[PDB]
Design a protein around this ligand. Structure first.
Ligand SMILES: O=P(O)(O)OC[C@H]1O[C@@H](O[C@H]2[C@H](O)[C@@H](O)[C@H](O)O[C@@H]2CO)[C@H](O)[C@@H](O)[C@@H]1O
Ligand SMILES: O=P(O)(O)OC[C@H]1O[C@@H](O)[C@H](O)[C@@H](O)[C@@H]1O
Lengths: 461, 461
C-alpha cells in the first residue's frame, strides 16, 4: 500500500535568476560574475548570455499567471545578489528589492508558496574584483548581510529558504574545471573556496534562526548517488570512496558540520586540505538545517581505478573512476535516466542524516519542436517526470519525509554555457540562440500533465 | 605508501568462556543456558559440549605462558556470568571471581592487556527459568549488577571492555533461527529480546562511566557488510535495504541510540517492532561507546527480491535476498573469504559513526593435521590472517582508527554446535570429538608467524 503525497506537499517548479531574468543593467543592478564571464569570447555557445534571457524581469506577471493556471503550489526562484547590493556590500538597492517584493506579492496573490534561493552562482563582480569573492573570508559577512536583508524584508511572507544552490557545482566548475567563473583550475584554491562557502552557509542559517524563527532553511546539493559496478570487493571499495569524496564531502558538512575523514586524509596527503581557523568547527556544527535540498538528474556508477589510472571515464587515481551503467537508459546527451536512483538517494539522506528532503530540481532537457498551432508534444518529458514522481511516492512510503518536488524548469531558460535549444520548461519560450524572437510563452503538453498531477495530488501520474 | 601500524596497536587473540574453560560444575558455578542446551541430544555434533572443552579453567597458566612466548599484546576473553552469579542475581560467588582475578594477574604479570568481554551467550539458566532471560526487562538490572561487580573487581587492571559480543547472533540464532538457546523461531519475540539487550548494553555503559572512568568500552557486532550484486538500480536498492536491516539496525543503536526509520517502518507494518517504554530512547542515546567492536568473517551480496519472493538464498520479500558473490574465494567450508570486505566494513563504520574500531574476532577454521614431532603446518591460516592484516593496514592508511586485532582463536576451542575438528587456534589442542586425549598444547606454524608480526608491529607479514 503506497502512502499518498502528504497534504501540504509542495508541488513546484523552479528557475535561477541569471537563466531567466534578463534586465542585466536595469534598475541599478550591478554586474555579476556571470555578466562578465559570459561575454568573454568563446565561453558560451553562440555568445549567448543573460542580458535578456527570457525576460522574466519584465514578464513576471504573465509567468506567474501561467503558474496559477497550472495550479503550482510552490515556485522556487533565486534572488540576484547584484540587484540587491550592486557592489556586493555597500548600499542596498531598493529598486532591486522591490522587484522581488512584487514577485513575492504576485505569487502569494495567486496562492503559490515562494521558495527563495539565496545564491545561484551570481556573486557581484565587485566582490571578485576587491577580494576574489569565495576565496576570501570577507564574503562570509558580506553574504550574511545580504541574506539578513532578505530575511528582514521577506521573512514574514516566505517560509521556505534555500541557501547555496549546488555549491559543489559552482565551486568545482569555478575552481577545478575552469568552466564557470572565475575560470580557475587549481584544486587547492577550490578546497579553500569550498571551505569559505561552507562557513557562509552556516553563518546565514545561524542568522536565519534570529530573523525567521518559524521558517525552514537548508542548502541544496547537486546529488548524483554513486553505485558500485558490481560485487567485486575493489569495485565496492571504489563506491565507498566515491560516495564519500563526491557526496559526503558536502552533505556531512551541511548536516553534521564535519568533513569525512578518509577524504580529508586523502586531501591532506596531496597538500589540498583547506585552512581551518579557530571557531570554524563550532560554527559549522551549530548550524543545522531544517532540510536537505536535492538537485537530482542521474546516478553515477564507479569501479576500481589504480594509482596510475584515469584522472568517457573520469576519476581520481587510486580512489575510483566512472563507468557506464549497463542497466539504465540514457538521454540523448548521455545522462543516465534512473528514477529508482532518486529513491535511492532520498533513502540514503534519510538513513544517514534523518533529514527531510526538498527536491529543488529534477527535469529533462530536450530539443522541443514547436508544431503548427503552437503545440509542443513533449511526451518524453512527461515520461521522465512521471517515473521520478512515482519513485518519490515509493520513498515517502518507505518513510522518507519529502517536503516537495520542484520540477526543472517552469519556463524554458538560458543554459549557462550551451544556449537555449536543449529546453527544460513546462512553458516553451519562443526564442533561440540567434535572437529573442517575440519571447512568447507557449504551454507544452507537459504543462497540462503536471497541472493534472497537482490537481489530484499525485494519484493520476 | 602504507602507514605503519600505530605503536600501541593491540595485537591480540581471543576466546569465549564456554568454548574454552570446562570446569562446568566446579567452584560453585551455576548452569548456563548453554550447559543445558548442548546436553539436549542431537543438538551438537557427536554430543560434544562444554563440560571440559579444552580445560582452560585448569590450564590457564600454561596458556598464558604461551601467549607471553608469542608476545601477545592483548588477550580477549569472556567472563562466564554463571561463575560469578550462579543463579544470575543473588549471591556473588567469590571462587568464580577468583578464577578471573588469577587469569588477569597472570596476564598482567606477563605484560598482556586483558580485554574483558562481559557477555558471550551464556546467561545463567536460573534467569531463563525465572523470567525468560533476554525477553524480560528484568535482565537489564540483573546484567547491570553483574557488570558492575566486574567493573568494581577488575577496573583497576582492565582498560578495555566489550559488552555484548555479537548480540545480532545470539538474538537472531536464539529467537529467529532457533539454532541457539532458547530455541525459538518467532520474529516478534526476537525483536523484543533485541530491544531489551540494547537497553542492557546502554545501562552497563552508563555504569562503566562511573566505575572505570579511564577505561574504554564498546559492544562488538558480527558484521557482514552488504554488497549489491551489480549496478541495476533495484539491486542497489536491495543493498540499501539489506545494509540497513542487517547492520544499521544494530550499529545505529550502539552509536546513535536510534533505530533506522525505513527498517522500523517495515517492522511496524508487520507488527514486529519492539515495545518501547518511557525512558528507553533517552537511555539508548546517552550511552556512547568508545569504540565499535567488530567480529568479521565475510561480506554478503544481495539482489532484488519480489514481494512474492525468498524468505541457498535468504531474505525479506520486497526488500532483498542473498546471492552468491562470484567474485570472492571460499574456505573449504564454503565461508566466503573477502579480506577487502574487512577494509570496506572498517571504512563504513568510520564514515558513518566516526568511531575507532577494535577487531574483536577474525580467523580461519580448518582441519589441521598433527604431524610427528608435534608439528602443525597451517600455511592456509597464515595466508588468511596475512591477507586480512594487510587490509587493516590499508584501512589505517585511509584514516580509520583501528585499536587492535584479535585473531580468533588463541587455542583451539569447542564450537557451539560442530565439535572440535574445524580448528581456529594458533595453538593446537590435542583432543577431538570422541576423546580428551591428553589435552596437550602444540604451537602451529601460525604461532610463530604471528609472533613475528607482533615483533615487527606488522611490518613483516
Ligand atoms: O566452528 P564454527 O561453527 O565455524 O564457529 C566459529 C565461530 O563462529 C563465530 O560466530 C560466527 C557463527 O559461527 C556463524 O554461524 C555466524 O553466521 O557468524 C558468526 C560471526 O561472528 C563465534 O563467534 C565463535 O564463538 C565461533 O568459534
Ligand atoms: O542545459 P544544461 O547544460 O543541460 O544545464 C541544465 C541545468 O544544469 C543544472 O546543474 C543547473 O542546475 C541549471 O542551473 C541548468 O539548467
Amino acid at each position: 500500500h503506497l502512502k499518498p503525497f502528504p497534504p501540504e506537499f509542495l508541488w513546484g517548479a523552479a528557475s535561477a535568476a541569471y537563466q531567466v531574468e534578463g534586465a542585466w543593467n536595469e534598475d541599478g543592478k550591478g554586474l555579476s560574475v556571470w555578466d562578465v564571464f559570459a561575454k568573454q569570447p568563446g565561453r558560451t555557445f553562440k555568445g549567448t548570455n543573460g542580458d535578456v534571457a527570457v525576460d522574466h524581469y519584465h514578464r513576471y506577471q504573465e509567468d506567474v499567471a501561467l503558474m496559477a493556471e497550472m495550479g503550482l503550489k510552490a515556485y522556487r526562484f533565486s534572488v540576484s545578489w547584484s540587484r540587491v547590493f550592486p557592489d556586493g556590500n555597500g548600499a542596498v538597492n531598493e529598486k532591486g528589492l522591490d522587484f522581488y517584493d512584487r514577485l513575492i506579492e504576485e505569487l502569494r496573490n495567486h496562492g503559490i508558496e515562494p521558495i527563495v534561493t539565496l545564491y545561484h552562482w551570481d556573486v557581484p563582480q565587485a566582490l571578485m574584483d576587491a577580494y576574489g569573492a569565495w576565496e576570501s573570508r570577507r564574503i562570509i559577512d558580506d553574504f550574511d548581510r545580504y541574506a539578513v536583508t532578505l530575511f528582514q524584508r521577506f521573512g514574514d511572507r516566505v517560509k521556505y529558504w534555500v541557501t547555496l544552490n549546488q555549491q559543489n557545482i559552482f565551486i568545482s566548475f569555478g575552481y577545478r574545471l575552469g568552466l564557470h567563473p572565475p575560470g580557475v583550475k587549481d584544486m587547492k584554491r577550490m578546497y579553500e573556496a569550498n571551505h569559505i562557502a561552507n562557513l557562509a552557509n552556516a553563518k546565514v542559517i545561524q542568522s536565519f534562526r534570529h530573523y525567521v524563527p518559524d521558517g525552514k532553511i537548508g542548502p541544496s546539493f547537486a546529488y548524483s548517488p554513486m553505485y558500485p559496478y558490481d560485487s567485486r570487493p575493489e569495485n565496492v571499495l571504489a563506491f565507498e570512496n566515491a560516495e564519500e569524496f563526491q557526496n559526503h564531502w558536502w552533505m556531512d558538512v551541511y548536516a553534521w558540520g564535519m568533513y569525512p575523514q578518509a577524504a580529508w586524509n586523502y586531501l591532506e596527503s596531496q597538500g589540498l586540505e583547506p585552512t581551518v581557523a579557530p571557531g570554524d568547527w563550532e560554527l559549522l556544527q551549530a548550524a543545522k538545517p531544517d532540510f536537505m535540498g536535492v538537485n537530482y538528474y542521474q546516478t553515477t556508477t564507479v569501479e576500481h581505478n589504480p594509482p596510475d589510472g584515469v584522472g568517457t571515464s573520469s576519476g581520481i587515481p587510486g580512489l575510483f573512476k566512472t563507468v557506464r551503467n549497463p542497466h539504465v537508459d540514457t538521454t540523448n546527451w548521455d545522462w543516465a535516466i534512473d528514477p529508482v536512483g532518486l529513491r535511492i538517494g532520498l533513502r540514503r539522506i534519510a538513513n544517514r542524516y534523518q533529514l527531510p528532503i526538498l527536491i529543488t530540481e529534477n527535469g529533462l532537457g530536450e530539443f522541443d519542436t514547436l508544431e503548427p498551432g503552437d503545440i509542443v508534444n513533449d511526451d518524453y518529458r512527461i515520461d521522465y517526470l512521471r517515473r521520478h514522481v512515482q519513485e518519490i511516492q515509493r520513498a515517502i512510503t518507505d518513510g522518507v519525509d519529502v517536503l516537495g518536488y520542484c520540477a526543472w524548469s517552469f519556463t524554458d531558460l538560458l543554459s549557462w554555457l550551451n544556449g537555449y535549444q536543449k529546453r527544460y520548461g513546462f512553458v516553451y519560450v519562443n526564442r533561440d540562440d540567434e535572437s529573442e524572437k517575440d519571447l512568447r510563452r507557449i504551454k507544452k503538453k507537459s504543462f497540462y500533465w503536471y497541472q493534472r498531477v497537482i490537481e489530484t495530488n499525485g494519484a493520476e501520474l
